[PDB]
Symmetry: C4
Subunit: 328 residues, 4 copies
């Protein structure tokens, strides 16, 4: 079955018929850092080689129009750049200058102002281009989405009874010793619907409660946590029994958002649970054990669940039993 979101977090959507494609060029920086690495590294190589060529020809051109080329056998003549024997030497000086290596076998001189104003322009644009590209690299290396790689979601969501309440539970973890700051968990139920009046709504998102009113959706996440959605009157699973579950066409999107401790930058880790990955009547297997001075987590057991005695009834039907029980 098709899902909206993959277990690893990527989203199965393509944006077609974007009539106004120039917008991608309007915020070029976003397109650049969003590219695949091969394409950054390609552009990176190109941006540098074309500038050095582009200036290299302008350095050659000053030397040509000046007549430096024509008098190389005459020492009386002095050029813009000492030693520009040909079209190759210009390329090298062009790099020697803009990288600011400037070996100084090729050296500029007093004799032309035409050259000085180029060295000037170059150095300036050399800084602006170099910023743009190095900046682009730094951002791409340091970007926070990468942290998501050391944030795990449990492979299944489970439904079982907890202190008399029927609960939907998934487990989350963080493989690093460092932290997710201002950590928080939110969850969205994704399923299509139809209004009384006729409107079909493709992949309708309804927020699932996972601590919003108590601030228990704000996580302190060191050892793995089991996030619990209590299936109450206000739940979208209120009228879903063990029987009905597999015949429902729904998907739970789970989103973990906080700041990578070292870069202040906010990360978003995502995963999905489709109807078949929601185990009814199950419990997560413990992972925590005590050792001398430290609590040790056993990630082998992180995804593992086991079965428990659990009603087949919808949460709603459990209430109906309770209403008669308290009234008895």
């Amino acid at each position: 079955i098709q899902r909206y979101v993959r277990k690893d977090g990527k989203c199965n959507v393509h944006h077609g018929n974007v009539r106004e494609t120039y917008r991608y060029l309007t915020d070029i920086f976003t397109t650049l850092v969003d590219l695949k690495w091969r394409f950054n590294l390609l552009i990176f190589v190109m941006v540098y080689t074309v500038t050095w060529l582009f200036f290299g020809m302008i350095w050659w051109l000053i030397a040509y129009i000046r007549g430096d080329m024509d008098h190389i056998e005459d020492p009386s003549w002095t050029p813009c750049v000492t030693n520009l024997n040909g079209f190759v030497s210009a390329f090298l000086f062009s790099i020697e200058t803009e990288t600011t290596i400037g070996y100084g076998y090729r050296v500029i001189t007093d004799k032309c102002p035409e050259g000085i104003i180029l060295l000037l322009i170059q150095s300036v644009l050399g800084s602006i281009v170099n910023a743009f590209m190095v900046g682009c690299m730094f951002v791409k290396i340091s970007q926070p989405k990468k942290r998501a790689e050391t944030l795990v979601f449990s492979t299944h969501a489970v439904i079982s009874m907890r202190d008399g309440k029927l609960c939907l539970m998934f487990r989350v973890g963080d493989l690093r010793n460092s932290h997710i700051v201002e950590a928080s968990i939110r969850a969205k139920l994704i399923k299509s619907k139809q209004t009384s009046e006729g409107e079909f709504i493709p992949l309708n998102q309804t927020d699932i409660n996972v601590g919003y009113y108590t601030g228990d959706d704000r996580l302190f996440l060191v050892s793995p946590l089991i996030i619990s959605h209590e299936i109450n009157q206000q739940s979208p699973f209120w009228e879903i029994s063990k029987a009905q579950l597999p015949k429902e066409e729904l998907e739970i999107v789970v989103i973990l958002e906080g700041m990578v401790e070292a870069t202040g930058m906010t990360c978003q880790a995502r995963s999905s649970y489709i109807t078949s990955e929601i185990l009814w009547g199950y419990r997560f297997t413990p992972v925590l054990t005590l050792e001398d001075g430290f609590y040790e987590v056993d990630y082998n057991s992180f995804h593992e669940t086991y079965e428990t005695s659990t009603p087949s009834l919808s949460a709603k039907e459990l209430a109906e039993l309770a209403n008669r029980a308290e009234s008895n």
Copy 2:
């Protein structure tokens, strides 16, 4: 008619009679990065050329006061900077030094401490100025407002019935495959008012509810979303019928705020719906279709709406019909 906010997000306000203009110089960095590009690139060129000139004259000056200029025919004499034949050579050494190209035809020496302490000062201020300016460039290129270019708002807001409730709806979209992290939507109604007591309040902002109490204002925005404001008792559209709408003098400001995935930086995309852009009795045309392995969006249809059967009554009058219907 005059609007407060343009559809593209820019705001029609000018800040006149700012008596204390020095404040703009107090936080210079904000003024700089807020400038138009022509003016950054201008200042950028200028800041660099004046330093190189300013030092170039000081390099010339040491050479003049020392008497290096007077003895160029004497090799016994050795200068601060080998080869400073005139006022031009000094400018070149000044750049050769501060860019740190340092071709080394112009080379400093032991003979003057006067020169060494300059090379010292220069290099230090060369780093501080270079930071300030390159930094200023980097910030301006990477700034998040730019993302707003690949965030679209629907061209109209529509009002129609949804599961028995009258709703104001606008649609939002994101043209990129990358994400808006900690995405959230808020909306402000802008219209003037008068208190019982007499006070006129120019462009009074009252927050429009778009999910605040359920956290459904926190968006997971991949494919386009239709943001719904339920027009209930607490709504500012409670007493507005189809008839009255066009004769109201109001404007809805819509604000999308989240973090650009790659730079942790927060973006704010804005748009406005003036009274004439609010289509009563309309529905948004679907955009989502299924393809092999991927959900495809059709942005051609993004802004498109169609008409449906919809009451001409205000939400309030619909309730009055319901009160008698339930009491019947």
Copy 3:
């Protein structure tokens, strides 16, 4: 009278008897960027001059222990660094190397590995020190608190009647065309108190409501806004009449927090209203006027207020009149 917070935002508190002062050295970066500019620029100059000296002596030392110094009249002998005639030349090479100007009159050679491993160490530490310091500069220039300079608070808070409710109002503004993203306003009442049991609490902070439950504390701030605190049953001004106000010993701290549009960084602008700056029975003078295509703000009038007819009674006593009025 002593205030806790100045009108410009600075806080009248000193942190004395910090026994564990090393902590300031533990997070050195915070102390550095928190310093006055004179002291950054001082340290900046020093950090660079001591490294260049420190290496300069090590460059001199290799040259001394090797015996390069003793043979300068012998060309057969070749040194670590060509041309190190004395203790001054070493300082210059040391800079020429670490700034990477490297004029190359002073050039390293094959003949000693002792020199190569220094050039190596230097270049590496040259990058680490240069990062630390340039970074420190960049941060300090770009820091967001500076924006606060172009965020104004009204000079007074006023109390007057608004649609039958008694309200405490202050006005806020933003002098720039650019934005404060995720803008929000919160306000704290600061006054001492005593518990029934005996405990004196020095400067007790109680949050003042300014939109928290409706999200109207989240500002869209283009033209100036009048922030309104409705003085209701839950207000700390519930039992304060015009008469009692000046004899109360209290201070309202007002805090504006949002993100500078260009740097994603969060700014905090603060101000205070002491009991004497709270004008009872007053209204803010309008500032907004319409011009062709643009709304123009008149900051001359920003702080200005005028008097209106307003009850001398506490909000509580107004309710008591209303209770008998509705019961009549």
Copy 4:
């Protein structure tokens, strides 16, 4: 007794049996900046020395395959790099080039394109590697967790009566004159539990209320603040008397999260109070005193508490006395 969180903020947990260790390499930047300094500085040294060697051999190799090595006695022959007498000179040119010191005793030439395309590759990768590493340093120096060093938590939590309510109180402070922006305090109670149905939950986190519904959890923190948790019906200390406290097996985790004023980056300071550090019947000793123009804090007294008359009863039992008192 074992705690979950240390008083200084570090967490007693180890992540064992991480089967998928490659993920650490997938987001390498996080692993790098998370390393101990010795290991950054080690890698930093290594990354640079291996590139310079790696290129140095390629520079040597071009010189070898070309036959430059074989003709050093022939001036007719001209090499890729003037002066590459051996395997050592190549290493030096390799650094001279990539650091961009380029002393220019070793200079590239026209004669080989083989060399030019290397200089090209090098300079490009020289920028990418240099970014990666300097960036990594900058991040690590500027990271916000460090601020936590100048944020103190009181050594004990105390329980005493405040205006008729039994309260759990701890005190927090900030040693710097600079601010924590968007400051906020949250607190989690950590103790194991067992569901009716059988499920043991290892270290169950239940959020402790410390201002969430009034926004008094949002701190304006200049002088020290006493954070108060009112022990009401909804409290986890509702049924805990002075008698029972020490026999409970619980731990309160306290978390302070806000932005370092200068870097926009968010900091998280943590501490813990185990059952024995919760003083029943105690009050914090004042720290604030007035001086000419400034409020002075006395951090000697910051942690100090003193005893007061305080009920031995649980908050619940105090209510039961009140129920009969009001009914009397």
